[PDB]
Structure 1
Amino acid sequence: SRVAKAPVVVPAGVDVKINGQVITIKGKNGELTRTLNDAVEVKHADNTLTFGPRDGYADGWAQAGTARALLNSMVIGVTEGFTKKLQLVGVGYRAAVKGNVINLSLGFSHPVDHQLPAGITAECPTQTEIVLKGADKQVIGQVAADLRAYRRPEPYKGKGVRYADEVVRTKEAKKK
């Protein structure tokens, strides 16, 4: 509704090719594509994109709002991109990036090596920090969740892979 009615202003240097339902957004950072729901009517007008419901579908507006939000993120992705930061806490917890594989020592008896997806690149400023870069918002979030899954922040000391912004609620050890 409100989300769908707002048009997405395509900035200069981004090419939007609409073929049926398949829409492709190409920019300097990369090229992203997806096929929209049949109930969504996407129109490219001037330097903006208008999303409206197609007749004959009950959901209609609901689908249009989703398509609008997705399309907006794609534009942002192919220009500035997205960044996710993870911080390690726990003493002995270290990370290192060798090419596209992230090697993590989370206090296990075996080494943990996580293979990165095609479009995601990573860097370690310090041994306890990982910064992910990419063009796809969904993919970058999935990778961050996978890394966090290995050692989720514990509730007594906060040790584990946590998001940089995430606040971890800590409790006391029973009583006495």
Structure 2
Amino acid sequence: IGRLPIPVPKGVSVEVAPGRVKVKGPKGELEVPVSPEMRVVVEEGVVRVERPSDERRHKSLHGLTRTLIANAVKGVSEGYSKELLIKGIGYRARLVGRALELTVGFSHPVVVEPPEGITFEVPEPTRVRVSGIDKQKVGQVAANIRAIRKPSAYHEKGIYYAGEPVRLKPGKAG
């Protein structure tokens, strides 16, 4: 009824191999997990995740294999770029090539490196983020960077995802 419907457009390399499902698209040969009982098909344009039951384990498993391998696909279709925005009077940014310029620790050496699907985008640099491929590892690295200085609820000067409304509290007494 509902927790298993998805199409596999682009004629993507949509195949199941040694107990691992191989989703190959712009290159992201993404390895989407395959629980032995979940099971799925990709015929015509329709890709379906099945349920060898419906109890707790399985049902969640469904939500998963479905959503996550769904990922495998959408991903293999484009290229996974994380939109991110650096912003704060205290900070600098430029690709440098394969790292993380960055400067707001007032002893700025910030020489980072790009894991993989990770390409650096400095078009601002106020607006500035990265592109990845692997939705999981991408949101992640993004995070790594955010984390390393970003916080600031009461005074801003950080890195922000899309940049949530950053809830902020007063300083002294007024």
TM-score w.r.t. the length of structure 1 is 0.86
Do the aligned residues in 2 keep the contact of 1:133 with 1:140 (CA within 8 Å)? yes
What is the distance in 2 between the residues matched to 1:18 and 1:103? 41
Aligned CA-pair RMSD: 2.2
User: 1:163 — aligned with what?
Assistant: 161
Give matches, 1:64-143, under 5 Å: 64-143=62-141
What is the distance in 2 between the residues matched to 1:94 and 1:146? 17
TM superposition shift of 1:89: 2.7
Do the aligned residues in 1 keep the contact of 2:3 with 2:66 (CA within 8 Å)? yes
Deviations 1:105-157 (A, max 9, x none): 12332412222112211110013332311221111100110011111230112
The structure with the greater share of residues assigned to strand is 1
Do the aligned residues in 2 keep the contact of 1:122 with 1:133 (CA within 8 Å)? yes
TM superposition shift of 1:29: 4.8
Bigger drift between 42-51 and 143-152 goes to 42-51
TM superposition shift of 1:36: 1.6
Q: Which runs of 5+ in 1 are unaligned?
A: none
Q: Which runs of 5+ in 2 are unaligned?
A: none
What is the distance in 2 between the residues matched to 1:56 and 1:73? 22
Matched AA of 1:12: K
Matched AA of 2:158: G
Match of 1:102, SS state, is coil
Flag as ranges the 4+ runs of structure 1 deviating above 6 A: none
Identity %: 37
Match of 1:97, SS state, is coil
